[PDB]
RNA sequence: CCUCCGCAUAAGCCUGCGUCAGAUCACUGACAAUUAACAGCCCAAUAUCUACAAUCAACCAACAAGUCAUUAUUACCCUCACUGUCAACCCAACAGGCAUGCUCAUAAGGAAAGGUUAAAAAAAGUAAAAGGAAACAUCACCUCUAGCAUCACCAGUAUUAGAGGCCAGCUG
RNA sequence: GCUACCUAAGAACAGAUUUAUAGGUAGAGGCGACAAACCUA
RNA sequence: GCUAAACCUAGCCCCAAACCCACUCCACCUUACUACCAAACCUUAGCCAAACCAUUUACAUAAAGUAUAGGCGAUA
């Protein structure tokens, strides 16, 4: 069953005038006139090409004359790719073992009560109430309006602790920074083209989390392979690509080392947003991508097991559900299914409030409900990492 | 329906007109590692960040200069939080609307079924600063309330529609950047950047090279009156209950490369003809000329990096409520 | 008239397609079918009725996974988003098909019968005779034209050399070739028949206005 | 110029140049109160804002800074003895703000 | 400056200004092309002067000081433009032999009549110009009847005019 | 009597020169207006 | 296109009838053009081809009015220009076959100045004559140079 | 409902009033976001001479004589422009004398025109 | 004293209570105006992507199943033009109608009475003793037809599609 | 451009709703919760 | 004695003779009057007459309203 009916297809030209069949004679057409005439023959025009070049009427060459048409298909992962099997597929493409819960090295930063902004419930209540209610002139702010403002204001609350820690004066957050990283995985080449908001750069790299006992203990782990799903579903099969490793930056850049990828889901529609398992998969591929490009910038394109492993953490959100991720990239020999594996610590479904009421009901007042500040304790644990 | 005062305005000599609409005296003047972080932001946006899509010239100040100014404010509010703890608890709104609606004057309707009737001429400013800093407490005033100053406000000789100023009817908004339930109603500082139309390259190409600095000055008066005035409305004051204390805010506005600095001291919400009879009091806008932050940027670093411009940014960010 | 049919997309797409009501009208704007028009809006999910299609640079039988068993407005049965290899596609659901179920689309005609599960698709030479089938082709490579509505089923009656004979739910028997693919089991959404519309609102919401044995057929 | 076919510009082509200007211009007095630096003209219909800027710059050496035009509808409401509408012709009005103070 | 829209400030209100003749054509055929360029701008600025003076004359409800020199300046712009077009045309006849500066063709629209079609500039050639090919430069056979009807309406108007001229001639011979 | 409920899109799309010339019968409408002598052949 | 009386008496309803011929997609081989054409044809045309002893004779013998097809007249102009030129493009590298085919139809030799105009409709001949006598006009520089060198050669002979 | 009135740009709905304009010429083109790009080359430059020391006023004195109208035919312009060069080079390749066969290499082509006025 | 009106945009109309002048219950001529930021006027190809409604979107709650999205490579550097902008207004009638946003009695808009008398009859309103009436469609059901694909039915497939039938009380 | 049904993409206050805009169906016709109603008095 | 009355001459009609028109510049089939981008032919039917209607029914001179045709009738 073919798609597209004949009435919507390009209508075939009527068959040629029978004069074009007689071999001896030149037809007499309306091409001597400069207009259609129905009692002369329809001429056959040579395929015209505009000699000069104009940009608004450019017609690019077909997909062989492009100077990088590699026949071996690269599967690309851009920020819009909504994966199918959720986290398992990114764990396969990443060659990593998952560990539920953040490590004690990160959560112990907020173990003492000294690492606290004063009245953190009042401040985070004001960030939630500001962005989700008090923000704009509209009566309720839409998600595209408030979600970067929730993330941005929480980063300003954690940025207000330069008074307690001077080291946070060595980190910036850049935006519209696009990294890229290609790696081989069993049979076919993969690329992540990373274009997400708020890569928080530092001067200093993050100190590693997993010891060599745990990295070595990843060898007996096996990746849970899956089926019928070939594990490249919903990536973008591109033939016209370029293998390239980009940290997003020119060389010689202060604040060069990625710290946290603050990637968010600010689409107003439920179908237009990433489902939260796919959100977590997008975080694993972006932190893997930027950490991997950091490894290619520090160590060449050498498939090896890294001695100074790179650790890049990321926070992804829908606006009220937070998903935390610490990624520990310790091998670049991705193509085998054995050896040491990367390892990642996740926090799933860490909502910082159940719901927000932007109008009073008649009973329940204006404001959030279900607020739980342990999630901001996790957020602020991730901001204080390496300080 | 009301006049629609645009702060970042193409109109010639719109500064003198806005001092009429606003009842302001424009007084010229004012009442280390920061250089490293500033040059890090400059070189970050011009040089170090790799662009996927090619930055054309029209696309520039949307792509290039806007996150430059965002990064400057977020890093200076970062680093200057120990020197000024009021910025540690101060809200930082990025591209957030400020509206103010006031009534200034009277007009008898010249044509129509309403002819010969007093219709007071309303105005609204809708503005988006690039980013503003709002404190829960209020900066102390620069000059005393009801400070006399001998220079006189302009008086236009014609209808404000003879400046290209146009009328619409839409929702009258008085808005500081957030609704009135927010605890941070008062305002510290406000950072603007002039749009692609108001480049000084065009203003030199067109023969209005005089009005270049006027553009800065107009964005001074319309924005800050719409901000301080809106702050005065959130504290309950209005045109008949005039402000009992002066409301003060502050603005560095720029072209991306040239910076100018402004202070604004709202003393009167009494702008109507009913309320400008026993009203000697007036609003005062302090201002500087424009000075370039850097001079050029080549391949690797900046050249001709001025330092007093960073010191006036910092001295704006460093004052405090009491 | 300006009738351009919406039935115009060329490539198969997993996404819903905005479709345009005809109103009962022709391409000439006159009512040919009375009593159509004015329903709730619907989007069209493109169904792949060629059930066995090997994908690009693959062949032979292949497994596929059910991701979601989805209501479809355009038809009576509900459908299944079903992904295998590098491609998702919408197929039509059988009665017990869960999310997460695995379904084998097979091509090899065995020597013996294949004790197939509830929702898989086999050539009619590979089935135990006297089983309920659905989504039956008419040529090898035609695509599944019949036994397609909600809860319907037809039983494979008997087969001759290179030929199977089906009982359609109107009990008219059909002679098709052996190597035409049909899916086993009965179509989902049973008790679509046992239902009370209750008010005429649901008659109007489905796009409906008010108004004004045969011989065993062959295809060999 | 007006009532002249313009040559088509293709990207990379020469500058379009007018050597004898077809369209005239007349500066009228403002019928309302206007600012001191605004000079009001009656542009003919086809003259754009940019043509007027270069027209006053080239021919009259006037430092023009802003130009704002309005098209004025002349009335088609006055009739002959024949009950046939006479149209007073429509005209474009240029409002010119002069530079340099 | 803007004072070139106004004449000599001594002439303001004098209600009569001595102006010379207009340029005739043969006086202008002796001038070079650079000189006709410069004279075009002399007459151009003078014409803007006189048009401001007309519009202010209608504004103040007064009559013009001398409306004749507007007729003289339009007279000279017409003669000068005609001279410049003569030299363009004679050079066109020598260099190419054409007679029209703009190309065209005798075509025959939907309405049957033969029209000089003036060509327009386009970028793409005519056979893939989507809007050009919606124009019909052929008349179908249901038009030839209306061509005959139009032909006979013109022949009636001509016959009426010729006959009416002869009747006026007979009245002249009866009167004289 | 408020049968005429005006719009310019329906007026030009109903009776304009382009719809009149789109058909042969409408071209004959134009030709009869041109032959009666009329000042407006269409909208 | 006519009418019948309903049962072959004039005292019944006069009701109208169209008599359509019987059409047949057949296929022919013109030896002069040397090509197989797929032509819709009727039984009477096949019979006239048989009575003319070939489609080349059927086309070169039948009068333009009698033949009454634009396509058959274009076949006639093709064959007649092929015979009017004695074309080597009939059978290249076989000159005996060319001369045998060309001598078989020697009867219908028409000059080339007449064989172009065979079967053109009047508007198509208006076009062909329009393209014959279209010329870029002569730039009057060349005409005036010719007259002036003529005049200086009259002064040279004085 | 008017037919006699001219269809001007002031007259339709918003979509009609925006499209139709007066007789002005396009200077550039619209781009995405409805952003008009102005092309510098399509704007006419008024080539305006220097009037300094120029001795021709707009009127002619009445003391000047009357002459006879002799329009410039191509025979005259050939005679004075070309004829001395051909008489000189004939008493002692027509492109030598100021003739060009084509003018596709030429900036100011005479047929069809590329200059304005 | 009314205000169930207003003010704007839309559509429509096309200078239609601006100034000067004049003729006429007591329009003509001249001149002048509506200034773009609002709104129209857009988009470089070729491929390839777009399963998870909206409802304060959170649970719940569903069915009639829903209004919103890119990436890959190539090309790409100039820039703010054009048009709308007025009014007491439109379609009718010689009563009515009109989309939307705000205001929900008005900050905006207006005037039911030319003067008199206070007859009849008529219209409307208020008061009144005592009395207190003196067929089609369609859920559902049945029947018949129809084994099928690229312009309806239908991008549907017999659980489908189509055609049929069905007292007391008050009151001029 | 009314009116009847339809379509596209909307809106409003709860639908077998009301409605603006643009398109479609044309007289041997259309359209009809069929009044042999309506289809510019 | 008000209202009015009057008025000749615009033009037109019928012949004859003769074969007409149609690019100042610009714009004009897109929503005509807008500077500029990827397909034509296919019997006229009926009114009316026949006192209805149903086949039928007109579209130089002279032969001649003759031969003919025709519900052998109206009529042609
Ligand atoms: Mg305008
Ligand atoms: Mg705009
Ligand atoms: Mg208005
Ligand atoms: Mg009022
Ligand atoms: Mg009265
Ligand atoms: Mg009573
Ligand atoms: Mg009869």
UniProtKB/Swiss-Prot annotation, chain B:
Q: Any one Gene Ontology biological process term?
A: apoptotic process
Q: Where on the tree of life does the source sit, at the highest rank? A: Eukaryota
Q: Which UniProt keywords apply?
A: Mitochondrion, Ribonucleoprotein, Ribosomal protein
Where does the protein principally reside? mitochondrion
The molecular function terms in GO held by this entry are:
RNA binding; structural constituent of ribosome
Query: Which is one Gene Ontology cellular component term of this protein?
Result: mitochondrial large ribosomal subunit
Give compartment(s): Mitochondrion
Free-text tissue specificity from the UniProt record = Heart, skeletal muscle, kidney and liver. Lower expression in placenta and peripheral blood leukocytes.
Q: Which family does it belong to?
A: Belongs to the mitochondrion-specific ribosomal protein mL65 family.
Q: How does it assemble?
A: Component of the mitochondrial large ribosomal subunit (mt-LSU). Mature mammalian 55S mitochondrial ribosomes consist of a small (28S) and a large (39S) subunit. The 28S small subunit contains a 12S ribosomal RNA (12S mt-rRNA) and 30 different proteins. The 39S large subunit contains a 16S rRNA (16S mt-rRNA), a copy of mitochondrial valine transfer RNA (mt-tRNA(Val)), which plays an integral structural role, and 52 different proteins. mL65 forms a heterodimer with mL37.
The protein, known as: Large ribosomal subunit protein mL65
**Full-protein positions shown:** 89 to 430 of 439
Curated annotation (Swiss-Prot), chain F:
Per the record, residues carrying Phosphoserine are: 22
The record's subcellular location field reads: Mitochondrion
List the coiled-coil residues.
Answer: none
- Which protein family is it in? Belongs to the bacterial ribosomal protein bL34 family.
Q: Assembly and partners?
A: Component of the mitochondrial large ribosomal subunit (mt-LSU). Mature mammalian 55S mitochondrial ribosomes consist of a small (28S) and a large (39S) subunit. The 28S small subunit contains a 12S ribosomal RNA (12S mt-rRNA) and 30 different proteins. The 39S large subunit contains a 16S rRNA (16S mt-rRNA), a copy of mitochondrial valine transfer RNA (mt-tRNA(Val)), which plays an integral structural role, and 52 different proteins.
What's the protein here called? Large ribosomal subunit protein bL34m
- The gene name reads MRPL34
From Swiss-Prot, chain G:
The main place the protein resides is mitochondrion
> Can you name this protein?
Large ribosomal subunit protein bL28m
Q: How does it assemble?
A: Component of the mitochondrial large ribosomal subunit (mt-LSU). Mature mammalian 55S mitochondrial ribosomes consist of a small (28S) and a large (39S) subunit. The 28S small subunit contains a 12S ribosomal RNA (12S mt-rRNA) and 30 different proteins. The 39S large subunit contains a 16S rRNA (16S mt-rRNA), a copy of mitochondrial valine transfer RNA (mt-tRNA(Val)), which plays an integral structural role, and 52 different proteins. Interacts with OXA1L.
Query: Where is it expressed, tissue-wise?
Result: Found in a variety of normal tissues including spleen, testes, thymus, liver, kidney, brain, adrenal, lung and retinal tissue.
From the UniProt record, which GO molecular function terms apply?
A: RNA binding; structural constituent of ribosome
Gene Ontology CC, one term: mitochondrial inner membrane
Q: What other comment is given for this protein?
A: Potentially represents an important therapeutic reagent for HLA-A24 patients. This antigen is recognized by tumor-infiltrating lymphocyte (TIL) 1290 in the context of HLA-A24.
Q: Where in the cell is it found?
A: Mitochondrion
Q: Which UniProt keywords apply?
A: Mitochondrion, Ribonucleoprotein, Ribosomal protein, Transit peptide
UniProtKB/Swiss-Prot annotation, chain H:
The lineage, from the top, is: Eukaryota, Metazoa, Chordata, Craniata, Vertebrata
How would you summarize the oligomeric state and partners of this protein? Answer: Component of the mitochondrial large ribosomal subunit (mt-LSU). Mature mammalian 55S mitochondrial ribosomes consist of a small (28S) and a large (39S) subunit. The 28S small subunit contains a 12S ribosomal RNA (12S mt-rRNA) and 30 different proteins. The 39S large subunit contains a 16S rRNA (16S mt-rRNA), a copy of mitochondrial valine transfer RNA (mt-tRNA(Val)), which plays an integral structural role, and 52 different proteins. Interacts with BCL2.
- Domain of life, per UniProt, equals Eukaryota
Question: Which family is this sequence assigned to?
Answer: Belongs to the mitochondrion-specific ribosomal protein mL41 family.
UniProt function note? Component of the mitochondrial ribosome large subunit. Also involved in apoptosis and cell cycle. Enhances p53/TP53 stability, thereby contributing to p53/TP53-induced apoptosis in response to growth-inhibitory condition. Enhances p53/TP53 translocation to the mitochondria. Has the ability to arrest the cell cycle at the G1 phase, possibly by stabilizing the CDKN1A and CDKN1B (p27Kip1) proteins.
**What's a Gene Ontology MF term here?**
structural constituent of ribosome
Grouped into one coarse class, the protein's main location is mitochondrion
Biological process (GO) annotations held by this record are:
apoptotic process; mitochondrial translation; translation
Q: Mind listing the UniProt keywords for this protein, alphabetically?
A: Apoptosis, Cell cycle, Mitochondrion, Ribonucleoprotein, Ribosomal protein, Transit peptide
Please verify whether the record's keywords include Cell cycle. Answer: yes
Q: Does the keyword Calcium apply?
A: no
Localization terms from the record: Mitochondrion
Which cysteine pairs make disulfide bonds? none
The molecule here is called Large ribosomal subunit protein mL41
């Amino acid at each position: 069953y073919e798609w597209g009916v004949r009435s919507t297809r390009k209508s075939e030209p009527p068959p040629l005038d029978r004069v074009y069949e007689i071999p001896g004679l030149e037809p007499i057409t309306f091409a001597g006139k400069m207009h259609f005439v129905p009692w002369l023959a329809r001429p056959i025009f040579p395929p015209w090409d505009r000699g000069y070049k104009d940009p608004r009427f450019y017609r690019s060459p077909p997909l062989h004359e492009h100077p990088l048409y590699k026949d071996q298909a690269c599967y690309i992962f851009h920020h819009r790719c909504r994966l199918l099997e959720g986290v398992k597929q990114a764990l396969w493409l990443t060659k990593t073992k998952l560990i539920e819960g953040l490590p004690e090295k990160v959560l112990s930063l907020v173990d003492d009560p000294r690492n606290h902004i004063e009245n953190q419930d009042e401040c985070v209540l004001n960030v939630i109430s500001h962005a989700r209610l008090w923000q704009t002139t509209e009566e309720i702010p839409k998600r595209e309006t408030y979600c970067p403002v929730i993330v941005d204001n929480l980063i300003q609350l954690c940025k207000s602790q330069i008074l307690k820690h001077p080291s946070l004066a060595r980190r910036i957050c850049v935006q519209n920074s696009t990294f890229s990283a290609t790696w081989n995985r069993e049979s076919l080449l993969l690329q992540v083209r990373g274009s997400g908001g708020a890569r928080l750069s530092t001067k200093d790299p993050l100190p590693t989390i997993a010891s060599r006992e745990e990295i070595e203990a990843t060898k007996n782990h096996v990746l849970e392979t899956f089926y019928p799903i070939s594990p490249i579903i919903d990536l973008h099969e591109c033939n016209i690509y370029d293998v390239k490793n980009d940290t997003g930056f020119q060389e010689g850049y202060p604040y060069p080392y990625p710290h946290t990828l603050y990637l968010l889901d600010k689409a107003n529609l439920r179908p237009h947003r990433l489902q939260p398992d796919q959100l977590r998969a997008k975080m694993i591929l972006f932190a893997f991508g930027s950490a991997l490009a950091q490894a290619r910038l520090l160590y060449g394109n050498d498939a090896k097991v890294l001695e100074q492993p790179v650790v890049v953490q990321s926070v992804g959100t829908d606006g009220r559900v937070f998903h935390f991720l610490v990624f520990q990239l310790n091998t670049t020999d991705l193509d085998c299914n054995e050896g040491v594996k990367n390892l990642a610590w996740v926090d799933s479904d860490q909502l910082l409030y159940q719901h927000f009421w932007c109008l009073p009901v008649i009973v329940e007042p204006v404001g959030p409900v279900g607020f739980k500040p342990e999630t901001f304790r996790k957020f602020l644990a991730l901001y204080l990492h390496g300080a | 329906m009301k006049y629609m005062v645009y702060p970042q305005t193409f109109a010639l000599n719109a500064d003198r007109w806005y001092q009429y609409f606003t009842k302001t005296v424009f007084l010229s003047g004012l009442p280390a590692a920061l250089r490293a972080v500033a040059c890090d932001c400059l070189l970050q946006e011009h040089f170090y960040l790799r662009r996927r899509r090619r930055v054309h010239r029209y696309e520039e100040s949307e792509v290039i200069s806007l996150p430059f100014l965002d990064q400057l404010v977020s890093t200076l509010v970062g680093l200057l939080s120990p020197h000024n703890p009021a910025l540690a608890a101060a809200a930082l709104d990025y591209r957030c609307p400020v509206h103010f609606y006031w009534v200034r004057g009277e007009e008898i309707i010249p044509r129509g079924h309403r002819r010969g009737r007093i219709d007071d001429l309303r105005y609204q400013i809708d503005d988006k600063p690039n980013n503003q800093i709002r404190i829960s407490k209020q900066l102390a005033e620069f000059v005393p309330l009801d400070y006399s100053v001998p220079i006189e406000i302009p008086t236009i000789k014609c209808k404000p529609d003879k400046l290209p100023l146009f009328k619409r009817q839409y929702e009258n908004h008085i808005f500081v950047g957030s609704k009135t339930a927010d605890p941070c109603c008062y305002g510290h500082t406000q950072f603007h950047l002039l749009p692609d139309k108001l480049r000084r390259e065009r203003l030199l190409r067109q023969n209005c090279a005089d009005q270049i600095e006027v553009v800065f000055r107009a964005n001074a008066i319309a924005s800050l009156f719409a901000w301080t005035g809106a702050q005065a409305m959130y504290q309950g004051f209005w045109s008949e209950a005039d402000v009992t204390r002066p409301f003060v805010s502050q603005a560095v506005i720029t072209d991306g490369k040239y910076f100018s600095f402004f202070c604004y001291q709202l003393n009167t919400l009494a702008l109507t003809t009913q309320a400008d009879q026993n009203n000697p009091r007036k609003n005062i806008c302090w201002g500087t000329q424009s000075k370039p932050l850097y001079e050029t940027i080549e391949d690797n670093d900046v050249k001709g990096f001025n330092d007093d411009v960073l010191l006036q940014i910092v001295h704006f960010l460093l004052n405090r409520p009491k | 008239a300006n009738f351009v049919s919406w039935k115009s997309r060329t490539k198969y797409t997993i996404t819903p397609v905005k479709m345009r009501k005809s109103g009962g009208r022709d391409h000439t704007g006159r009512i040919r079918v009375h009593g159509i028009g004015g329903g709730h809006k619907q989007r069209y999910r493109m169904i792949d009725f060629l059930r066995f299609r090997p994908e690009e640079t693959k062949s032979g039988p292949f497994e596929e996974k059910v991701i979601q068993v989805r209501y479809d407005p355009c038809r009576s049965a509900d459908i299944a988003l079903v992904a295998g290899g590098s491609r998702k596609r919408w197929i039509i659901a059988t009665e017990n098909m869960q999310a997460g179920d695995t379904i084998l689309n097979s091509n090899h005609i065995g020597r013996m019968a294949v004790a197939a599960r509830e929702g898989d698709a086999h050539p009619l030479g590979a089935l135990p005779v006297g089983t309920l089938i659905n989504n039956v082709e008419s040529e090898p490579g035609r695509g599944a034209q019949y036994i397609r509505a909600a809860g319907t089923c037809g039983v494979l009656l008997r087969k001759v050399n290179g030929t199977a004979i089906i009982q359609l739910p109107s009990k008219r028997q059909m002679q098709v070739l052996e190597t035409c693919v049909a899916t086993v089991g009965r179509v989902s959404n049973v008790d679509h028949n046992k239902r009370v519309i209750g008010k005429a609102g649901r008659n109007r919401w489905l796009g409906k206005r008010p108004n004004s044995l045969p011989p065993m057929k062959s295809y060999v | 110029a007006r009532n002249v076919v313009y040559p088509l510009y293709r990207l990379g082509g020469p500058q379009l140049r007018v050597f004898r200007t077809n369209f005239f211009i007349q500066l009228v007095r403002p019928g309302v109160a206007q600012p001191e630096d605004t000079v009001q003209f009656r542009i003919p219909m086809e003259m754009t804002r940019v043509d007027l800027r270069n027209y006053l710059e080239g021919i009259y050496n006037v430092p023009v800074a802003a130009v704002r035009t309005r098209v004025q509808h002349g009335s088609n409401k006055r009739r002959d003895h024949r009950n046939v509408r006479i149209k007073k012709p429509d005209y474009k009005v240029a409002y010119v703000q002069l530079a340099h103070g | 400056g803007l004072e070139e829209f106004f004449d000599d400030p001594k002439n303001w209100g004098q209600e009569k200004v001595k102006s010379g003749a207009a340029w005739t054509c043969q006086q202008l055929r002796n001038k070079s092309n650079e000189d006709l360029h410069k004279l075009w701008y002399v007459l151009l600025k003078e014409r803007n002067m006189l048009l401001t003076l007309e519009q202010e004359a209608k504004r103040q409800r007064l009559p013009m000081p001398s409306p004749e020199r507007l007729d003289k300046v339009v007279d000279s712009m017409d003669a000068l433009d005609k001279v410049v077009q003569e030299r363009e045309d004679a050079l066109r006849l020598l260099q190419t032999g054409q007679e029209r500066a703009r190309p065209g063709a005798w075509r025959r629209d939907i309405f049957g009549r033969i029209i000089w079609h003036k060509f327009k500039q386009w970028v793409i050639p005519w056979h893939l110009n989507k809007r050009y090919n919606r124009k019909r430069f052929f008349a179908l056979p249901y038009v030839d009847h209306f061509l005959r009807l139009e032909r006979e309406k013109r022949a009636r108007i001509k016959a009426r005019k010729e006959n009416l001229e002869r009747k006026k001639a007979k009245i002249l011979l009866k009167k004289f | 009597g408020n049968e005429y409920q005006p719009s310019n899109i329906k007026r030009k799309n109903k009776h304009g020169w382009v719809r009149r010339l789109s058909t042969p019968a409408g071209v004959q409408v134009i030709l009869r207006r041109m032959l009666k002598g009329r000042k407006s052949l269409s909208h | 296109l006519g009418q019948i009386y309903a049962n072959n008496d004039k005292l019944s309803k006069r009701l109208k009838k169209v008599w359509k011929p019987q059409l047949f997609e057949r296929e022919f081989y013109s030896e002069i053009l040397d090509k197989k054409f797929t032509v819709t044809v009727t039984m009477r045309t096949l019979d006239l081809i048989d009575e003319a002893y070939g489609l080349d004779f059927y086309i070169l013998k039948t009068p333009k009015e009698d033949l009454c097809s634009k396509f058959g007249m274009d076949l006639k102009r093709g064959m007649l220009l092929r015979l009017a030129r004695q074309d080597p493009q009939l059978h290249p590298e076989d000159p005996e076959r060319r001369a045998a085919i060309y001598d078989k139809y020697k009867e219908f030799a028409i000059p080339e100045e007449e064989a172009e105009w065979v079967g053109l409709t009047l508007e198509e001949a208006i076009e062909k004559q329009r393209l014959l006598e279209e010329k870029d006009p002569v730039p009057l520089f060349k005409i005036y140079v010719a007259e002036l060198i003529q005049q200086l050669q009259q002064q040279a002979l004085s | 409902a008017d037919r006699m009135s001219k269809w001007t740009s002031k007259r339709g709905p918003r979509s009609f009033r925006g499209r139709k304009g007066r007789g002005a010429k396009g200077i550039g083109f619209l781009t995405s976001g409805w952003r008009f790009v102005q092309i510098k080359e399509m704007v006419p430059e008024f080539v305006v001479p220097d009037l300094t020391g120029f001795k021709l006023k707009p009127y002619v004195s009445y003391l000047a004589p009357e002459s006879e109208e002799t329009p410039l035919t191509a025979a005259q312009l050939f005679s004075e422009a070309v004829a001395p060069a051909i008489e000189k080079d004939f008493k002692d390749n027509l492109e030598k004398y100021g003739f060009e066969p084509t003018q596709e290499g030429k900036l100011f082509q005479l047929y069809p025109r590329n200059f304005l006025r």
